[PDB]
Amino acid sequence: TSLANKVTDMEKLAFRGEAKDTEQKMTALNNLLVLCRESESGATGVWNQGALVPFVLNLINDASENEEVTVTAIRILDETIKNSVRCMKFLAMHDPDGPKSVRFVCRLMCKKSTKDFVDATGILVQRVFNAMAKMDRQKEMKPDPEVAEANKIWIIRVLLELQEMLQDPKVGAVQRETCIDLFLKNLMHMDGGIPRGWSWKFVEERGLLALLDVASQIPELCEYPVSAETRQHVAICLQRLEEDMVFDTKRTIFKEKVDMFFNALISRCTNDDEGHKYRIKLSCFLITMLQGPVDIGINLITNDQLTPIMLEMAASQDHLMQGIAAELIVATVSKHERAINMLKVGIPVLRALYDSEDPTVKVRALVGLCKIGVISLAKTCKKFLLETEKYSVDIRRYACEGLSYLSLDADVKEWIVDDSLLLKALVLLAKKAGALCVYTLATIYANLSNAFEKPKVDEEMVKLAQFAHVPETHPKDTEEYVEKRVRALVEEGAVPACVAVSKTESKNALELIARSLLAFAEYEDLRGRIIAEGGTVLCLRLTKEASGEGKIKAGHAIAKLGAKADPMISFPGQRAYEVVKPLCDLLHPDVEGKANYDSLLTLTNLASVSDSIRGRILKEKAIPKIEEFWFMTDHEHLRAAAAELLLNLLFFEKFYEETVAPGTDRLKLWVLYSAEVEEERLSRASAAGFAILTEDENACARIMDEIKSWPEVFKDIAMHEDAETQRRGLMGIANIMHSSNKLCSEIVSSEVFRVLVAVTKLXXXXXXXXXXXXXX
């Protein structure tokens, strides 16, 4: 009950009214947040047989309450409901009836409208999917199809609630975006979500049609709160659904639903004033197509009825319809040349739309010209981006899109870096617009470190063509120029712009960020600074929630950050514990990036702090991964780092005894690696670990009987070239004869006895041998 008394103290100071100051209540909250996050017993005591949730719910219903206080209560509650027992008890505890308690939890995001509150409520619904299917996107934990169908009736209640909230006009835009992010993360089994057939039921049901209505929206024309940030949340989850319809029976069915939606819209494309807005919703739809499931929409681009309606709304006198046509046709330009089958005619059209002076039309007319790139267009975007107070963030998003399309040229990149106040504009963009511009800003960082071509898989064949005068390499992609670009970007703060746009799910763009971060951590002087701005929080979240292709680079960037770092400053606690899972999955010897040595140096720094660090590594089946690098003969950086890792990992009690255990043949290599003693890197480890292993008597007996031809090894480490390897080894031999006298009896009768007595007459092993002599 000392637990039960220490939750009573923090209980009165949070809920039962013991506070004459806000920050001391914040102190009790931050104490409980640490307290529940440290043990499961914290989540037991704070639960208090369910006494927690009503205190919190009467806290949320304050209009006078600070933001960070309430969000702190949620940061406790979602940690509380990580138990599957407690969360399922929580789910229906808000109504004797089932589905109204379901809707009461789903409408918890509509209490307030700050971005932080809505992102933490989406963590609350996330932990529910983690309670039902027993799945985890954070720990790559697959669901159990046993327990999914065991409580299917709860799930259908939830899906109805969500597809109710998607067309519920009483719900604001930032919350509706967060619902869509829950469909992206937790639904798809291709993304490790709800299993097969579930998404087939959703398509067979009317929820897909709700999403198609949502893609046909804008903040300017809506029936319900939509922001411009919403569409990029829609288009990804639509492409992820296309990634989840694995059978061509179902892709047949998917094309069959969406054509009914489309042809109903074109049945409603009339010239009437009612009929204009269906043309505008078609324009909002097709751009949402091209941003995501590019594949289906081009099959609808070949429909030839489209482009005269594009001309009608361009000749219309409403400027909203013309600005939306500009951003339509600029999304039409693809990497498929049959888009030009529609696009070959509209080339001068936007060339005319720049001539109009409406700026909302103008910046959308500026992009695309940026796509087909000529340095004067960069001079023009220069004009829009530097103007901050006058222009809105909705306009200044499009200039970033135009400049990312301009950043394909190598020579314009240098003109970009020569500006500093541009970057001042970039940080004041990302920290004011938040996560609004992620595809494009990451597209720029990829172009700056040349991270698109960072898959240099084709350069191996290009130099095979050079094995046979004609081509043109370009000098602005030389390693020194990129070192200039990158040191300029780190000097003017790319990292806080990265974490402010990190609140999305865009694996296209989150790939582009990981690729840029990997080139950023190439140099050691700035990576401590990158860590100083929270880059570790960023990279770990990246390797948890990016594209699977980007996770290799994400963990590799994590590996470069912590190579020779002090891990206590660079990784506090919970941040350190989750480090093990990503990089142990990167150790594939058949891959062999220059990541493996970075991996092992990181882990060896990690293994020196605490037992909970090094214990969680063995659970990850790291040991068979480390042994194969430790079996290698050719490499030098790898095997000694695996040895120094395995040097530090013998502090763990159980691993110390797994090596002494009779099933393994590892103690052979701990001494034979002191014998092939051409180098000092591996010999120093295999003699220090030997000095640790031989303090145990049963470990000494397994040396002699299990090693044929052993005194040859000991005479080699006695008549020894290096001095440090030899002196560590001799104390690990000194404790042998201290242990058992029958083994020491097999030492005087052996060959090595004469060189042992030879060395004592010359440093530290001298009195070790003298101690050995006392046995007789």
Residue numbers in the entry: 136 to 508, 525 to 619, 622 to 915, 926 to 939
Please give the exact wording used by the authors of the publication that reports this structure:
Subsequent studies in C. elegans, Xenopus, Zebrafish, and Drosophila confirmed the role of UNC-45 as a myosin-specific chaperone, promoting the folding of the myosin ATPase domain as well as coordinating the assembly of thick filaments during muscle development. To better understand its myosin folding function, we established an orthogonal protein folding assay in insect cells, characterizing the interplay of the C. elegans muscle myosin MHC-B with its cognate chaperone UNC-45. Structural data of various functional mutants clarify the role of the distinct UNC-45 domains in this process providing important mechanistic insight into its myosin folding activity.
Surprisingly, however, deleting the entire TPR domain fully abolished the chaperone function of UNC-45. Accordingly, the TPR domain does not only serve as Hsp70/Hsp90 docking site, but accomplishes further critical functions. Finally, we determined the crystal structure of the UNC-45 ∆TPR construct that represents a C. elegans UNC-45 variant in monomeric, non-filamentous form. The asymmetric unit of the ∆TPR crystal form is built up by two molecules. In molecule A, the UCS domain adopts an extended conformation similar to wt UNC-45, whereas molecule B contains a UCS domain that is strongly bent, with the entire domain and even more strongly its C-terminal half (ARM repeats 14–17) extending away from the central domain. These data further highlight the pronounced structural flexibility of the myosin-binding UCS domain, which is held in place by non-covalent interactions with the adjacent central and TPR domains. Accordingly, deleting the TPR domain releases the flexible UCS domain to adopt various conformations, two of which were captured in the present crystal form. (2) Our structural data suggest that the TPR domain obtains an additional intra-molecular scaffolding role. It undergoes van-der-Waals contacts with the UCS domain, thereby arranging the myosin binding site to accommodate substrate. Our structural data reveal the capability of the UCS domain to adopt distinct defined conformations. Together, the wt, G427E, L822F, and ∆TPR crystal structures depict four different UCS conformations highlighting the pronounced dynamicity of the myosin-binding domain.
